[model samples]
Target: MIFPGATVRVTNVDDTYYRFEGLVQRVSDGKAAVLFENGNWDKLVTFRLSELEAVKP
Candidate 1:
């Protein structure tokens, strides 16, 4: 199951947010809250559990 603190990657190449790695902040209602931090930018986005794949850290 996808849960908090899990490192995940977006799996859609056609999507605008594809290929960005982030950590799972929290999960609820079959969706995961993922946080991405690069340089001075930080993005927190939500995606379906089915759309995320667990990555080795």
Candidate 2:
């Protein structure tokens, strides 16, 4: 599983063209609460840890 503070790129399930970049703020079960670079908390964006494409510094 991806840890908190790890950066990731997540594609929105609702809209595939809408992708978000954020730091992993919390993870519980298969759900994630991410604090995005745009300063939005996109809560519960369902994604697998293996789907995490990039880990930014």
Candidate 3:
């Protein structure tokens, strides 16, 4: 599904919460750039295609 710009709550490998409540900056090269809930830009959070999950809006 196209999840760009969708609010999502992501759980990392360690099960840490990385909430993104803004538009998805991009998803490519098996990585995603998310504009986080706190307005910080996280671009190094790369994950396998199966590692990323998104909550339905």
Candidate 4:
């Protein structure tokens, strides 16, 4: 189960182009709540129910 506080990586190439390092704040089953903070406010983002993968640490 990918619960909260799980480190994950998500990539989106359909639009502009962005690879986000997100922390799983909450995931309702397949649905995910991730937090992506890259210092900048614009880059600081959140994702919900977005397709993501686990980042092996």
Best by TM-score: 1
- TM per candidate: 0.87, 0.55, 0.48, 0.62
Stretches of candidate 3 exceeding 4 Å from the true structure: 13-22, 39-51
lDDT (0 to 1) per candidate = 0.87, 0.61, 0.52, 0.61
Count of clashes, each model: 0, 0, 2, 0
lDDT of 2 at 47: 63
In order of TM-score, best first, we have 1, 4, 2, 3
lDDT of 4 by residue, 4-57 (tens): 788777766652225666677776646776676656743334444455677853
- Judged by whole-model lDDT over C-alpha atoms, candidate 1 comes out at 0.87
On lDDT, the stronger of 1 and 2 is 1
Weakest ten-residue segment in model 4 by summed lDDT? 41-50
Location of the lowest summed lDDT over 10 successive residues in candidate 2: 37-46
Instruction: Return the top candidate by lDDT.
Output: 1
Residue 24 error, candidate 1, Å: 0.2
Local accuracy of candidate 1 as per-residue lDDT tens digits, 1-57: 667988999997765579888999999999998998889999998998877899965
